[model samples]
Target: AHFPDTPAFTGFNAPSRIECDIPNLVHEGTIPPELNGAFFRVQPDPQFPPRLGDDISFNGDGMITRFHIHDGQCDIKQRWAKTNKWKLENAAGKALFGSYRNPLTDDESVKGEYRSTANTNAFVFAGKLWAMKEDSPSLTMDPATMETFGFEKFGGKMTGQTFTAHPKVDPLTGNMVAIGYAASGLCTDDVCLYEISPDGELIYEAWFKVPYYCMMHDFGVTKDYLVLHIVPSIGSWDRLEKGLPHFGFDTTLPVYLGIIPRRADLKQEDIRWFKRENCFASHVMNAFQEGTKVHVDVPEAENNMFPFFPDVHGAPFNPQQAMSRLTRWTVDMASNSDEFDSVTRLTETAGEFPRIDDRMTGLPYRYGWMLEMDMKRPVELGGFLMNCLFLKDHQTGAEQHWWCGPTSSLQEPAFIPRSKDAPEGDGWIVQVCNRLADHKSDLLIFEALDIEKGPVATVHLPFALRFGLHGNWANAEEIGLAA
Candidate 1:
């Protein structure tokens, strides 16, 4: 009953639902549930078509974070029960948060270039930092409360390139971390890090230079180390002058993964960089300090996603061509290592960016697909293909494992800790794949067993999900008294 009529799946109609009662301990922080709730933060800009070329203006960006209660299920397609604006949280879900009119006036700008994540309960956002105070002739609310978290300015000038935050709370020290990038452009060194208190006081600041150039996609934090998955070079704007299609530029760039220890004082040369070109933007789970080995799922590498083309015959278009592949690398901290090393090369095929092709009779355009690689048969490396394979790893220099590829684009796959002493089989892994052929999306679930076995559950979503950018789950036990 979990997965009914589908191509890869064949079963009679059956009803199945997972039910769990909310315990009083959950209400009183007395005892928490096994898993936390899941939430998705996506920039669903209606002004722009799903295509990257549709919206060129900076205003074309709109972000909303939907909170979904995960009842130990893989269904993430339903309308969220609660929602909030990224920079602003409104009970009505109407006001846009962190976006101020004339951001220049208050030195506040809607910086949506980077995907946001939650470090414990703290909400973290990264992007360009500009310094300006909110000023309005008709304003009545206290400016300190409205613009209390503006960009950090040095010498009274906004730093163009660095990460900034619309922070909430820091779980590590019960303080707030004012997130900022190193310097933008070519002159800057390590990516800068700064800590701010709940009272908006700057505590610690330092920089860690990743060996390769990468724009913000997402990062992971353990109790003492910060793990980042970065791609080389931001899709540059200079490509337009070369008379090359924007989409072409993204296809040409290579991706890289870098890692650094959290306590190494990122400002020092204490970090090492390893070369991982197959990695795309992904999430890191099962990360903890156990003598220093970071265990992660280095999913197979697929094609780059680059399908945003103009629908109309001659419409003016400007596209941000960024191609992505699914490769994973691990860093060994036990030996005080800083460089990223290839644990396993999952898939042999390189997936391409999704293309918007109108020629299709029914669907609007074709989305990207995951490909397979046979390192054993280098000459047999397949092309824009699909397979029944998923990849995960427990340690470095491991075998490149494969799993059945159900009918979905395996986007960000996350690991769920089922129990403290649950062993390997007790946990679960979930991923969102858009079933382009069926005009729908799927929330696929797999048992934490070996890769050869199929998924334990597959939840079908009614609508196609463009992308589940960045998300984190707060097990019922982690929720504060507010619920």
Candidate 2:
């Protein structure tokens, strides 16, 4: 089974796995002496061809890449986060899996096994690096070698079938909070909220059910409440049985927000569900609570962005027509309101992969960063086709943008503080930039407060990295790479 050569399979979506160690990468400008850390990223890089005739880019296996930067030198290294699927298929030397999450289409040897690719997101937490996907438990990895350490169940406390890719780590309390949808089984509405202590202990776990089996890609969390968006991108048991796409957007269904307490024992009835107009968001920038009001910021679209999840009428999806803006939704808890009427459009520009300073998580903050899309360019499903990195000042409505030009694209920009005590926006924005014209990549570093000034330093990479979903930074002490 050879890999399919489709339109979505070209460019940054092409699958490849290589291990390299390039020391002292060429730099265009000055590299910050204080910038002493490793930027770790995980992308879906399939090792073999898909059993199905064609497969979506999101269904690939996980590959972890790291750029170790210290003093004035930088080095690159990458390795695949070895999963059961990867090992099993390599033994057979062929594609063992079929459609995404369709057990009926998988090989007999891999049946009843955890079929998660673990390819969505990666971050350093509790002094460990974790690769995560929403369908299964997070897999820990060696920060230095990016080697797999098997599934993390928090000392056997996390019993859910899936864990979210977007987990919020509180800088103030040193606690990590996360959730899992479809925790019980496929097409099940069961969801679980988990709270882990700073010392890698699972402190709390609560379970609840959504209105339906929705594609809960991401979630929101404030100091007091856990916010869940139940959009119309829903899954069905019937669709899976009929060998169809597991999820689809039902325009007939309304969107919903399920708000529950953060640290309290909550039942299904304890959740306060608020309804809103039909909209879909894959990521959330930040969320905070003020008095009785909860504000959630995200790049929202009117329809599903991925082609597999089509509308009820199967209408064509135009990336330009489906552009999402920085929108804020407010939920009033005191009023017992069933409808969310206080919606505000924050930015006119369309973007995705919204991020905020880690210190400001679960608190009112000013700055939000993301990859801003150029509406003129065609939308890509597997990777980000954005030309600019966007930074928005939620306080003054002043925005800062840095474009990579017509022949380049940018991945998600990770915010790194100058020091532990530095001000919110006083840091660096680090990301991988793909120069399509030259078939190469570079690590772009921008002053967070002045992104429009362009890269303060560009660490040139010998090869072009496939655009990745999400990544985070770990300091020298965290990576153990310091002298």
Candidate 3:
């Protein structure tokens, strides 16, 4: 047997987990007194070798890493979220699972077990730390210890098989909106929209059907509307049956945006579908509503960005040409049509993993942060390398950029406000950056308003931390870090 030597199989993508604590981390500058909180991040770290000799970056187990800051001290901890699949695989002492999300290729003994890795996003919501993956329910964890507490289902109201990794929490209403694709089957269009209260209660669950079984990875939510982008990255029953990759990009299909009122009684029929040119959006910067117009800002790609998903003809996508730009889409409710009236390009920089002040979510906001990714440079296993941190001022059309030298790469930037009542965008941007030169990791903190000035402080880690996907910052009071 032979294995393909791909970029995703080595370096930062290598599967490894560590449980360690480092108190009073060495810093290059002063740590902010107001930046005392828990910065939790989730990474995909497989515990065992892949069953098929190789796997994609997204097919790993969930590892929750945390940085607790208090009294100018930073402490670190990492733990793997204990899922049924992880426990069973550990007990067996080998890779029991087969291809990603393909139950038919799994071992006979663990046929009925839940296979969600829960390795996508981590955040503190409703007084609990949740490690979330779009294909499964969220797993709760202790903020201080990083101990998993099993799956969270909002008291059984969340009956969907999957929950979105990009759930939006409204700062004004204290409510969260999420969506789940493939809620019914492997290649079905059944989707569910969930409205959760700030108290972690499931207030409403509405089921809707999309035009096709597409990869609805993320969505946008405004105060009164929910926006879902249905692109052509789709799954097929035939592909799974033939032991092929479950998802592929079909370029022939047009992208559709489904807009629904955020009311509890909203049904599938209430959704208005708006058509747009073929494109893909993995993350949304912000969304807002004015009168009868709803606006959404996203990083739009000309074609599929992920190499795992090729077009219908099996033609690979060129990342350099498929580079995404910050774009805006406007839907007018006054016009009784099924197409977007405006699609404007906002930025020329190619990037992904956009972040903004959480308090400004679902509202008109000014500042946005993202990584200026160099897609041409393939990292370890198989992903783009982060070249610089790019900050955008939507109102002034101004930009600020910072780079951690040529040998360092950054993950998603998690924004933490200086105070609850502080002016918008006046805060700190926290990111876990891996230094390829020394094979070490560090926590980089930048003043949100002046990111181009570089880090105000850096907490150096004792070891190299693998790059992760998404994370959030919670104050000491929110995660009980002070306690």
Candidate 4:
């Protein structure tokens, strides 16, 4: 439930002060020569040249930036822009641009050393700007064809240069929101949001400051707010003090849920930025209406540095271990003029790996579940705890049931609501569980209605997808929600 704006509200608008110019810089990398004009995967495999792991001492982790259709449908055309050596590729991994195009940043020097680890990746968009480049600012690519127009010089701590695109069609305005980011380094939060039209028109761009900076990996729009699930950036000194060395995550900083009202005027000086209790290091935060309240699906913990980041192979898990509780907050705009006034903490528990399901529609009444990824097993045998639970009412702090499984470490599961095809509360929860086999992982799919009943299916992935951030289903239209 939301409230009405105050009558004294005078409209505020900010001019676009950011610049977008394409630069001329290219690095050597090969794109698939053949063009099929169809969407395909850009699986770089184990040997995607230029030695990805030699830059850092973090071991061998190959980077793969593959092209695939947003919904795994259609074909992508490959093209290159010569001015900045921008190599364009289609969903099928074909080089759309010519040989004069380059993809690396100005500061990047690619040695002919190929290692087996994850390097960052990016996708070009618009026509004149690139979204994920270490040196360049603004998005590059032809607006109409989504091909590279060139690079533009923009300013800021340009880290997170390798984020992918999260294309979502806004139902209210019918515009496309391309969500991507570059690691602006640990100093500042370097995530960004770009508003583009279906025709690829760059509209509005805004980002949070580094201190409040949280790399916005995945976000969703409900009727009232844009819910962003992010791994909040801890202070650099704080991270260094922790000394865990595993990806350098200091457990001291609190993970936050950034709430941006869709209609908020970004240009105003006294703009309001609201945040709630911490969710664990989550990549994707999905928000939708189920009755009258907002439901969040993510890893919950006031803080999660210790339990999740335990020392492995003599390396400490993060430096400090703040005991964080699994939490949920409900905001009722109807009850108070200020949304903050209506904020209510629904539940809190000493747990880790949190997720929520908000598939219902309306207010004060909603139905779904929550889960926790608990690692309570012995290290020698890789014993860990993965617990699943449910949430009925945030105001009442009521939980219908919870079950702890010796399941593998997992990402958030996709939950499909009851639909026409299967009316008896038709829904499916799909997730990847990487406990039994660490390198190669398995899939776990459950019937939303049958969680208390039992899981309906369990599918295994062909190989283990190395653990990373969070994400949801690309294709929601197949079900009934998006459409």
- Using lDDT, give the best candidate's number: 3
Writing each residue's lDDT as its tens digit, candidate 2 over 1-483 gives 366788546666676666677878888888888889989887787788777767876788888889888887678888887777777888899888878867779988888777777788888887788888888888888887677888888888887888888889977688888999999988788999998888888898899888888899888889888988888887777878877777777778889888888863878888899998787777889888888989998788877777766665677665554688889989889866698848888998789889888889888999999899865654333333688999899889998878788778888889898888888978888999988877888998888889898999999988878758899987878766775
Residues 209-294 of candidate 4: C-alpha lDDT, one tens digit per residue = 42354334455556655555545432233433453322333344544444555542443332233344433444323456555455
Residue 457 accuracy (lDDT) in model 2: 91
lDDT of predicted model 4: 0.35
Model 3 lDDT tens row, 1-483: 233365565766665678777788888887887667889898888888778788887888888888988777688888888888888999988889888767877889887777888888887888888888877777788776677788888888788888888888988888888888899866679988898889889999888898888888888999888888888888787888987777888778889988878877878788899997788787899888878888999999888887876676778777765688899999998878788979999998888889999899888889999988754454553357777899999999998888767677888999988888898998899998888888889999888889888898899998887768899999878876674
Model 3 Cα displacement at 286 (Å)? 1.0
TM-score of 3: 0.96
Please give each candidate's TM-score. Answer: 0.48, 0.96, 0.96, 0.50
Kindly report the root-mean-square deviation of model 1 from the true structure over all alpha carbons.
13.7
Better of 3 and 4 by lDDT: 3
Badly placed stretches (over 4 Å) of model 2 are 376-384
- Check candidate 2 and list the clashing pairs: none
Each candidate: RMSD: 13.7, 2.1, 2.4, 15.3
lDDT of model 3, residue 90: 91
